[PDB]
RNA sequence: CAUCUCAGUAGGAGCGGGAAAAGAAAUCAAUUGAGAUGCCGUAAGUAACGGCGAGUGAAACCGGCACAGUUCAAACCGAA
RNA sequence: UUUACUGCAGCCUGUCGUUGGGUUGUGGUUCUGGAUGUACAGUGUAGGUAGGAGGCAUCGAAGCGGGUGCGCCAGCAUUCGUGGAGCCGUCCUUGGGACACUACCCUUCCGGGACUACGACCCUAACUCUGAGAAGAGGACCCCGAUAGGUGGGCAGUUUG
């Protein structure tokens, strides 16, 4: 996988903000895993700076099993901020896009291309 | 199915040498070898293992990695008169297991805390690595916590040194009931150490 | 006398309280039962071990003292 | 004290773990193109043992080149071609097996592709030594844990009526 474009990741962060505003976000690795397994996850954002890597190592293969678009964020502080949280967050799952559904599907198509 | 990510961590660590943990093990023992005997860590390596063993993300709960050598009881040949049975020591492994050795070294390193449990986190041809959870009975968070405030009692102090952890009870032979536990419960010393 | 016995004794190291440890069966039974743990009596110098020598040596059942049950990890919620 | 008995250290050596990646050499793992099968002669190659008989064909059946499977420069499959009828057998070529294009697992066939136990070589990336370090030298060896055998008055306990 080539490095996902910076503007595409920023679009992902903006979609996370908009899903905070209107839709539904499951912030936290356990919640995001539950959402992906249930098939409600429209978009998955996975932090890259996770120690240990076992915490979110399964998220990628799970989302590729269940056909959920997923993207990688540089580190977890701004991912938690985009999830509107005072702590870090290793992964979030947008399950209701609000008015960000079109941009979420744009990111999904772009990820499918870049794959 | 709707499984927690702790389940995935469990599956990943079920057969670690057949999963990505083997590669992670390769990079990770390099860092661990450079480290000393007892290292404090921010988060458990196996979060699901820690949580099932009693780890919580709260003040007064410390997690440490302990390095212990491999093999049996490195024993000295006696230099005085012995029976032939009591002369040989090379094949004499101990009665103290490596996990409990690691727990006791962690307890020695951290005098104010109490060992709760520990779990295997790695090993090589020379060393094994364990992660020991310790609790601060004098922290107000632990005092408030009604699932851990038993550790504030006078009898909960010195658990690892007196064999009161799960590994210690396994080494004492009280992991089972019924036949085979005739000389182990309620204590090894209670039957003149004839059990074990 | 070498396995054995002496004996996990003597001695050592660590921890530790007014008590400590154990403690609510992945148990004991046997045709179908009981129901946390500890301690005492008994089983019994029996079963078992053993140059099957010397010796070592239970437990369950049963009768008593005293009786006590519960908390997490996970599933569901998601900072409540 | 020792070539007394029985052991225990140390040391030598096999195996496992530590311990990875490549190149070839060794066994079959697994399967494509042929069922390749043939004392005696064959119109015809048992087209595996077979409904002991019964389907195809100028929209394909052969006598030929080093004969693409094979082999006794025969003959079955029609392919590079050009020559202008191979039947099944109740005339069974008086049968080691006697034979219909009918889901070929089977002594071959050498893409053996893929994992495997042993052995040889290389790489570094683990690991080791040196240095404060850059780095240099080794290197999956050595050390180390375990296990198996040897050697072993170095040491222990005894016996030597």
Contact at 8 Å (CB) between A10 and A107? no
Angle between helices B5-14 and A29-38 (to 10 degrees): 90
A55 to chain B nearest CA, in Å?
7
φ, ψ of residue B3 to 5 degrees: the values are -105, 150
State CA A81 to chain mean position distance. 13
Q: B53 and B45 in contact (C-beta within 8 Å)? A: no
- Asked if B3 has any chain A CB less than 8 Å from its own CB, the reply is yes
Percent of residues in chain B assigned helix, strand, coil, to nearest 5: 40, 15, 45
Nearest to A30 among B1, B4, B12 (CB): B4
Enumerate residues 6+ apart whose C-beta is below 8 A from A1: A114, A115
Q: What Å resolution does this PDB entry report?
A: 3.5
* DSSP label of B78: P
Considering only CA atoms, give the Rg of chain A: 12
- Is residue A51 packed enough to be buried (19+ CB in 10 Å), middle (13-18) or exposed (0-12)? exposed
d(CA B91, CA B68): 19
Task: Provide the CA B62 to C1' D118 distance, Å, integer.
Answer: 50
**Tokens standing for B86?**
């009591």
- Contact between A32 and A93 under an 8 Å Cβ cutoff? The reply is yes
- Strand A70-73 relative to strand B114-123, pairing: unpaired
DSSP state of A89: -
Buried b (16+ CB within 10 A) or exposed e, A63-82: beeeebbbbbbeebebbbbb
A52 touches chain B (CB under 8 A): yes
B43 and A58 within 8 Å at the Cβ level: the answer is no
Tokens 């539950």 identify what position?
Answer: A34
Q: Select the residue of A29, A51, A52 nearest B5 (Cβ to Cβ).
A: A29
Counting every residue written for chain B, the total comes to: 196
Burial class (CB in 10 A: 0-12, 13-18, 19+), A88: middle
For residue B63, which phi and psi values (nearest 5 degrees)?
-125, 135
Q: What is the DSSP string of A19-68?
A: HHHTSEEEESHHHHHHHHHHT--SEEEEES--SSGGGSTTHHHHHHHHT-
Solved using: cryo-EM
The single residue listed with the structure tokens 């699901």 is B48
Helix (H) or strand (E) holding A72: strand A70-73
Tokens 């990820």, residue located = A111
Residues 6+ apart with CB under 8 A from B43: A51, A52, B63
The rounded distance, in Å, linking the Cα atoms of A46 and A89 is 9
Q: Which residue of A has its CA nearest to B42?
A: A51
| Axis crossing angle, helix A59-66 with helix A29-38, rounded to the nearest 10 | 20
Which runs of E-coded beta strand occur in chain B? 38-41, 61-69, 114-123, 127-135
Phi/psi of residue B183, nearest 5 degrees: -110, 15
Q: How far apart are the first and last CA of chain B?
A: 44
Sheet holding A24-27, edge to edge: A24-27, A91-96, A43-47, A70-73
Q: Are A14 and A97 in contact (CB under 8 A)?
A: no
Closest CA to B116 of B160, B58, B57, B51: B160
Separation CA A39–CA A68 (nearest Å):
8
Cβ atoms of B2 and A34 closer than 8 Å: yes
Residues of chain B neighbouring A56 (CB-CB closer than 8 A): 5
The span from the CA of A26 to the CA of A94, in Å, is: 6
Residue A44, exposed/middle/buried by CB under 10 A (0-12, 13-18, 19+)?
Answer: buried
Contacts of B32 (CB under 8 A, 6+ apart): B65, B67, B122, B129
Q: How far apart are CA B31 and CA A66, in angstroms?
A: 35
**Contact criterion met (CB < 8 Å) for A37 and B12:** no
């Amino acid at each position: 996988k080539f490095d996902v474009p910076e503007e595409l990741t920023n679009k992902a962060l903006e979609a996370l903000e908009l899903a905070r505003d209107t839709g539904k976000i499951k912030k936290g690795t356990n919640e995001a895993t539950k959402a992906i397994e249930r098939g409600n996850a429209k978009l998955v954002l996975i932090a890259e700076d996770i120690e240990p890597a076992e915490i979110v190592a399964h998220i990628g293969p799970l989302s590729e099993e269940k056909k959920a678009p997923y993207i990688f964020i540089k580190n977890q502080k701004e991912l938690g901020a985009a999830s509107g949280l005072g702590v870090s967050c290793a992964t979030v799952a947008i399950v209701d896009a609000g008015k960000a559904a079109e941009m979420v599907q744009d990111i999904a198509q772009k990820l499918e291309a870049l794959k | 199915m709707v499984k927690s990510f702790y389940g995935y961590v469990r599956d990943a660590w079920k057969n670690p040498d057949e999963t990505y943990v083997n590669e992670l093990r390769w990079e990770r023992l390099q860092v661990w070898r450079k480290q000393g005997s007892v290292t404090r860590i921010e988060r458990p390596t196996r979060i699901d293992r820690a949580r099932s063993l009693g780890y919580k993300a709260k003040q007064g709960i410390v997690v440490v990695r302990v390095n212990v050598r491999r093999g049996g009881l490195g024993h000295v040949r006696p230099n005085r008169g012995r029976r032939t049975q009591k002369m040989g020591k090379n094949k004499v492994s101990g009665g103290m297991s490596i996990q409990r050795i690691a727990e006791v070294r962690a307890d020695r390193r951290y005098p104010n805390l109490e060992v709760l449990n520990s779990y295997w986190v790695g090993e090589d041809g020379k060393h094994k690595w364990f992660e020991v959870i310790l609790v601060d009975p004098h922290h107000p968070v632990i005092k408030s916590d009604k699932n851990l405030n038993w550790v504030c009692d006078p009898s909960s102090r010195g658990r690892a040194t007196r064999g009161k952890t799960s590994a210690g009870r396994k080494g004492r032979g009280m992991a089972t009931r019924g036949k085979g536990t005739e000389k182990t419960r309620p204590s090894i010393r209670a039957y003149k150490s004839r059990g074990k």
